[PDB]
């Protein structure tokens, strides 16, 4: 076959994969390819955003072990 | 900043003079780093402008 | 330079590592803006040419 | 009429008065306008230089006064 297999690829070929994801993947929610506009990216974006803020507070915290801890009593 | 601060809450306080001229010559370069990203290029958008 | 050696005077000697790096970096923002105030260039004409 | 009080104005109204503002003043003391070189400018300048330098001695003084006072007695 043709494309078949495990053999190698590109960088540009990997965009251009995941820009053909999107498109088919809001053609099943919204029936309609127009993509005026992009909500899916920015949906998937707005995760992300929160579980970076997440993992900023926990080291957050992790440096504030280091600056005050628990033995310094009376 | 917090990897130096947390050196300091340890006591060893081995900056100031020859120690602190690291950080000082490594904050230049990332710094450096950023703003060469902005010289892309020479032609105006500005919602004044529009 | 003058609002730094005041303090030397009345002996609280803050700076020093943790504290020598706001006045350190600050000068650098100074002479930042001066060399964005020269911009432009390349006319060329000078007294050796004339 | 047109011109009369207290209206808008703009930043190239306010040297475009000024530069009229030279132009007449030299008019008066020299009787001739071609102004090859604009000497009010520099008379001007001269005197703000004046100013300034006096202001910067002065908070030399003040500055001194900090670092070796008269109140260090006994």
Known sequence: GSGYGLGLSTRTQVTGYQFLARRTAMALTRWRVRMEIEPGRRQTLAVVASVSAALVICLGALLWSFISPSGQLN | ?50
């Open chain 2, 1 to 50: 900043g917090g990897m130096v601060a947390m050196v300091f809450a340890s006591g060893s306080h081995v900056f100031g003079g020859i120690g602190s001229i690291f950080p000082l010559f490594m904050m230049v370069g990332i710094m450096m780093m950023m703003f060469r990203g902005m010289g892309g290029g020479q032609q105006q958008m500005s919602r004044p402008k529009l």
